[PDB]
Structure 1
């Protein structure tokens, strides 16, 4: 059925709402993946930062199944992330300059393209392209992925309707996987 935050594929310390679309962090960085992942084509989803108290943060993006649930997204070779703090992008624990930061009330967009042509990961802030973050990524299945540092709160939207659908970007909503 519908795409949701995964039932078991999640760090146990994260507090997931009953509807499985909202999650709150707990102490050190930890991660939850969606219930469905994609292998080919172009796909999109959104995450809204509901609340970002002082000294809390998020690293949001895409993860293969082996991505470590007890580490920030982007920690290892299995995922790619975008940090709320300073807009840094992370992969294999290397943080690089990417965009400006994002915070409470921001609606972030997450694009991936896996041609059956080069693979790409692109991040959006309230509908606006923040630039290509990663290109020619590792082959595999990628799941929408949330990692949180301390008690900030985010909500994921897999579609079909997005808050800020990007202009001239073709994709299927992650909800199509449902």
Structure 2
């Protein structure tokens, strides 16, 4: 699945393979223009080059948010800090979970029957924490806000590396 042309953070290091985001110095958040509306859309994020001293806050955000909003600013954006697993949501800092390894296959998912929610930290099918609950309905483009210029890829295939086991999803060969 290809990425966006205009709905992106412009000054980031755009890689030519069209499946890899490379960052800058600072929290300028790219929102790739293919995200959920209803039901289910699951994809994985393969990680190629994750050097240390990075805050890879990953999660969900809306097109209402700023492009310069770090992911973890408001009630719409979520947060997952590297150091001491801390959540930063509605500007609330509470040391939540532990850190995370290097070189796995990441990937998040929301389960909403058309609402009953699965907003839970997902990593190779291993839970790191139940994140939040009961969002409103809108558009949720995936949001990437990085601290270094780390080479990280993305996956869209049906044959996942480590999916959530017994997952209700939809393939990315329909709307992307």
TM over 0.5: yes
Q: Do the aligned residues in 2 keep the contact of 1:160 with 1:175 (CA within 8 Å)?
A: no
- Provide the aligned C-alpha RMSD in A: 2.3
* Unpaired runs of at least 5, structure 1: none
Distance in 1 (CA, whole Å) between partners of 2:81 and 2:157 is 22
Q: For residues 38-83 of structure 1, give each alpha carbon's deviation from its aligned partner in whole angstroms, at most 9, with x where no partner exists.
A: 1211332222332232322211111111222213212133322323
Distance in 2 (CA, whole Å) between partners of 1:101 and 1:175 is 33
Q: For residue 138 of structure 1, give the secondary structure of its aligned residue in structure 2.
A: coil
TM superposition shift of 1:136:
0.5
Larger mean Cα displacement after TM superposition, 28-37 or 168-177: 168-177
Instruction: Specify whether residues 62 and 154 from structure 1 end up closer, same or farther in structure 2 by C-alpha distance, changes over 3 A only.
Output: same
Q: For residue 168 of structure 1, give the secondary structure of its aligned residue in structure 2.
A: coil
Q: For residue 86 of structure 1, give the secondary structure of its aligned residue in structure 2.
A: helix
Please report the TM-score for the alignment, with normalisation by the length of structure 1: 0.84
Q: Do the aligned residues in 1 keep the contact of 2:47 with 2:154 (CA within 8 Å)?
A: no
Distance in 2 (CA, whole Å) between partners of 1:20 and 1:88 is 31
* Structure richer in strand, relative to its length: 1
Structure ID, larger Rg: 2
TM superposition shift of 1:133:
0.9
Aligned length: 176
Q: Do the aligned residues in 2 keep the contact of 1:52 with 1:103 (CA within 8 Å)?
A: no
* Unpaired runs of at least 5, structure 2: none
